[PDB]
């Protein structure tokens, strides 16, 4: 990705967005219970703790881009990855507005929490006015929908999330680029049944795990792979993504019965976007804020993966590459070893950084032991080992604990949290628990026992 031009939103005539200035996090009843060294991230360019310009830090994720056509590889790996999506007979119809809106089978009703973007983020009107799941009522919707059309600027905010000391003191905030409700109502409408077919079947078939349940899910990821596995990470995958690989994502999406609507990829590929007082044009990068992000990101990582094995190994089976993909997260295997190093390699000639999986300091040997998805570990039960576990380090917990938003939403963030947390074993949780209970605030909570939720997992299977 990379940006083509930006300058000041009334020079082309586009109002000023307002972002908070001020986080809504607060140190929470926990702050100093438990140990962590995460702070809210800079969301002005005043922040007494930057250390650095923040526009040029925010700005910086946009790397350029790398390529300019599809190669043989990458048409290669179109065909075979398209080719097991059509496998699953995936619905090729439109969704009608209504499912479209408050969901089906499949697919969430839109989350009315989140910004509705442009230009109702200038009318100040809100997503709680537009729509409603009482009567399921389309015509408000549709109704805007003829009066502002599609392909609306994108609002981009500055997420307001915890992050390092380090990435506090260089500016380094996440962005969040929220797109029209119209838009997202669109695509839901265009892809609504490719978005479903994704959610009820996370596996090795989509490569995609959007929408799982780790809970169970973890128990049939190893049965998926392959012997060897092999990982890596990736540094600002979404912004690094050139317009190549959205042509081969359209490419896949053509292939399955939705060149109908290809046209809607160009819009995350050339974007136009909003911030502050600027607007900006944008070739390449995926946004973070559209609808479907998280499974057309995992697609391309699909396409990714695939390219740079069939660059660097001739002769591959890409029917014994077994997958999976959240976005940029991925856990991979092959029935023979190979290389991350040199795969990374040859990703950096598609315009990608990859680097050693988990931060480590060299390319090492990926096993069930060190192998992380969606940050969580893997581990067998002790008592019934073909239940596998996943487990999120404490370290996690520990620093969302340490910080609320909404005293209100107490309750569910840390009973959200003990769901994440007893996975780490009986003697850690009660630990957990314990600490919990120490001040006024978590002995007024209602927290399931450790026993409790093990016996709910046991029989959830």
């Given at each position: 990705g990379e940006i083509q031009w930006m300058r000041p939103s009334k020079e082309v005539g586009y109002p000023i967005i307002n972002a908070p200035?001020?986080?809504?996090?607060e140190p929470s009843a926990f702050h100093y219970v438990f140990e962590g060294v995460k702070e809210p991230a800079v969301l002005t360019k005043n922040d007494p703790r930057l250390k650095t310009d923040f526009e040029e830090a925010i700005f910086s994720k946009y790397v350029g881009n790398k390529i300019t056509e599809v190669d043989e590889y990458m048409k290669e790996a179109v065909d075979h990855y398209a080719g097991q999506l059509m496998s699953l007979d995936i619905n090729t119809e439109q969704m009608c507005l209504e499912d479209a809106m408050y969901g089906t089978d499949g697919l969430e009703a839109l989350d009315l929490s989140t910004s509705a973007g442009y230009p109702y983020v200038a009318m100040g009107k809100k997503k709680r006015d537009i729509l409603n799941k009482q009567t399921r009522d389309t015509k408000e919707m549709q109704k805007l929908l003829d009066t502002y059309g599609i392909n609306l600027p994108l609002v981009t905010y500055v997420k307001d999330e915890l992050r390092s000391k380090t990435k506090v003191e260089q500016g380094k905030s996440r962005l969040i680029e929220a797109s029209s409700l119209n838009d997202s109502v669109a695509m839901r409408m265009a892809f609504g049944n490719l978005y479903a077919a994704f959610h009820k079947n996370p596996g090795v078939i989509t490569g995609s795990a959007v929408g799982c349940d780790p809970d169970l899910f973890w128990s049939k990821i190893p049965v998926l792979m392959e012997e060897k596995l092999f990982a890596f990470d990736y540094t600002g995958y979404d912004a690094s993504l050139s317009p190549a690989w959205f042509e081969a994502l359209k490419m896949v999406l053509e292939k399955i019965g939705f060149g109908d609507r290809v046209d809607y990829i160009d819009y995350l590929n050339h974007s136009h976007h909003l911030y502050k007082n600027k607007?900006?044009?944008?070739?390449?990068?995926?946004?973070?804020?559209?609808?479907?992000?998280?499974?057309?990101?995992?697609?391309?990582?699909?396409?990714?993966?695939?390219?740079?094995?069939?660059?660097?190994?001739?002769?591959i089976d890409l029917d014994h590459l077994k997958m999976i993909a959240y976005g940029d997260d991925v856990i991979a295997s092959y029935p023979h070893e190979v290389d991350a190093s040199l795969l990374a390699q040859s990703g950096k000639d598609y315009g990608l950084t990859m680097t050693p999986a988990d931060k480590s300091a060299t390319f090492e040997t990926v096993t069930w032991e060190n192998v992380t998805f969606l940050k969580r570990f893997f581990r067998a039960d002790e008592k019934y080992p073909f239940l596998i576990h996943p487990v999120m380090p404490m370290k996690e917990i520990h620093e969302s604990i340490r910080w609320t938003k909404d005293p209100r939403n107490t309750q569910d963030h840390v009973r959200s949290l003990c769901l994440l947390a007893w996975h780490n074993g009986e003697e850690e949780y009660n630990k957990f628990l314990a600490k919990i209970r120490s001040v006024p605030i978590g002995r007024a909570?209602?927290?399931?026992?450790?026993?409790?939720?093990?016996?709910?997992?046991?029989?959830?299977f």
């Open positions: 200035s001020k986080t809504k996090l607007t900006y044009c944008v070739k390449g990068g995926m946004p973070s804020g559209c609808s479907g992000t998280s499974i057309f990101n995992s697609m391309i990582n699909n396409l990714i993966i695939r390219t740079l094995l069939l660059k660097t190994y001739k002769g909570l209602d927290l399931p026992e450790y026993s409790t939720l093990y016996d709910r997992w046991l029989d959830s």
